[PDB]
């Protein structure tokens, strides 16, 4: 008989609920959390970003840069021994 | 030799106390809060 039934006026399940707080958070916070970032530095001809590219990539964890840096200093004081004497 | 047997202690000590103050400020203001920044950024993402 009756045509009076809940769905005609719904006006508070079409609004309220807790995940809205999370929703509005991640449209503002995460749209500017760019997918690749702003492409962070790791190379360039600044004469020391090139150093970073061969040795200090976040991938490298090999003993090669350590050795490379060490060998210069061995040559430094030994030559300087002959520069002072 | 004199360079490997310094008696240059006052000259040296000037350079010594300067280096400590330089590193102290440098860490404190630049590199240390940038490490807490990494932690916090990861954690704030963790929150959302």
UniProtKB/Swiss-Prot annotation, chain A:
Question: What keywords are assigned to this protein?
Answer: ATP synthesis, CF(0), Hydrogen ion transport, Ion transport, Membrane, Mitochondrion, Mitochondrion inner membrane, Transit peptide, Transport
Q: Which domain of life is it from?
A: Eukaryota
The places in or outside the cell where this protein is found are: Mitochondrion; Mitochondrion inner membrane
UniProt keyword annotation of Signal present: no
Q: What are its GO cellular component terms?
A: mitochondrial inner membrane; mitochondrion; proton-transporting ATP synthase complex
GO BP terms: proton motive force-driven ATP synthesis; proton transmembrane transport
State what this protein does.
Answer: Mitochondrial membrane ATP synthase (F(1)F(0) ATP synthase or Complex V) produces ATP from ADP in the presence of a proton gradient across the membrane which is generated by electron transport complexes of the respiratory chain. F-type ATPases consist of two structural domains, F(1) - containing the extramembraneous catalytic core and F(0) - containing the membrane proton channel, linked together by a central stalk and a peripheral stalk. During catalysis, ATP synthesis in the catalytic domain of F(1) is coupled via a rotary mechanism of the central stalk subunits to proton translocation.
Summary of subunit composition and partner proteins:
F-type ATPases have 2 components, CF(1) - the catalytic core - and CF(0) - the membrane proton channel. In yeast, the dimeric form of ATP synthase consists of 17 polypeptides: alpha, beta, gamma, delta, epsilon, 4 (B), 5 (OSCP), 6 (A), 8, 9 (C), d, E (Tim11), f, g, h, i/j and k.
Additional facts recorded: Present with 14600 molecules/cell in log phase SD medium.
Q: Which family does it belong to?
A: Belongs to the ATPase F chain family.
Instruction: Identify this protein by name.
Output: ATP synthase subunit f, mitochondrial
This protein's species is Saccharomyces cerevisiae (strain ATCC 204508 / S288c) (Baker's yeast)
* Lineage of the species this protein comes from: Eukaryota, Fungi, Dikarya, Ascomycota, Saccharomycotina
| Annotated gene | ATP17
From Swiss-Prot, chain B:
Q: Keyword check for Cell membrane, yes or no.
A: no
Q: Which GO terms describe its biological process?
A: proton motive force-driven ATP synthesis
List where the protein spans the membrane.
Answer: 13-32
Pfam families found in the cross-reference section: Fun_ATP-synt_8
Q: Which InterPro entries match?
A: ATP_synth_su8_fun
Give the main localization category: mitochondrion
Q: Where in the cell is it found?
A: Mitochondrion membrane
Which terms are listed as keywords in the entry? ATP synthesis, CF(0), Hydrogen ion transport, Ion transport, Membrane, Mitochondrion, Transmembrane, Transmembrane helix, Transport
One of the record's GO cellular component terms: mitochondrial inner membrane
Q: How does it sit in the membrane?
A: Single-pass membrane protein
Superkingdom field? Eukaryota
What terms describe the molecular function in GO for this protein?
Answer: proton transmembrane transporter activity
Q: How does it assemble?
A: F-type ATPases have 2 components, CF(1) - the catalytic core - and CF(0) - the membrane proton channel. In yeast, the dimeric form of ATP synthase consists of 17 polypeptides: alpha, beta, gamma, delta, epsilon, 4 (B), 5 (OSCP), 6 (A), 8, 9 (C), d, E (Tim11), f, g, h, i/j and k.
What is stated as this protein's family in its record?
A: Belongs to the ATPase protein 8 family.
What function is annotated for this protein?
Mitochondrial membrane ATP synthase (F(1)F(0) ATP synthase or Complex V) produces ATP from ADP in the presence of a proton gradient across the membrane which is generated by electron transport complexes of the respiratory chain. F-type ATPases consist of two structural domains, F(1) - containing the extramembraneous catalytic core and F(0) - containing the membrane proton channel, linked together by a central stalk and a peripheral stalk. During catalysis, ATP synthesis in the catalytic domain of F(1) is coupled via a rotary mechanism of the central stalk subunits to proton translocation.
What protein name is recorded for this chain?
Answer: ATP synthase protein 8
Give the species this sequence originates from: Saccharomyces cerevisiae (strain ATCC 204508 / S288c)
What is the taxonomic lineage of the source species? Eukaryota, Fungi, Dikarya, Ascomycota, Saccharomycotina
């Amino acid at each position: 008989v009756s045509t009076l039934i809940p769905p005609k006026v719904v006006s508070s399940k079409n609004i309220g609920s807790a995940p809205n707080a999370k929703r509005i958070a991640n449209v503002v916070h995460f749209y500017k959390s760019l997918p690749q970032g702003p492409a962070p530095a790791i190379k360039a001809n600044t004469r020391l970003a090139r150093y970073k590219a061969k040795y200090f990539d976040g991938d490298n964890a090999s003993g090669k840069p350590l050795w490379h840096f060490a060998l210069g200093i061995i040559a430094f004081g030994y030559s300087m021994e002959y520069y002072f004497h | 030799m004199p360079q490997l047997v310094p008696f240059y202690f006052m000259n040296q000590l000037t350079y010594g106390f300067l280096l400590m103050i330089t590193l102290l400020i440098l860490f404190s203001q630049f590199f240390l809060p940038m490490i807490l920044r990494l932690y916090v950024s990861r954690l704030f993402i963790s929150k959302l």
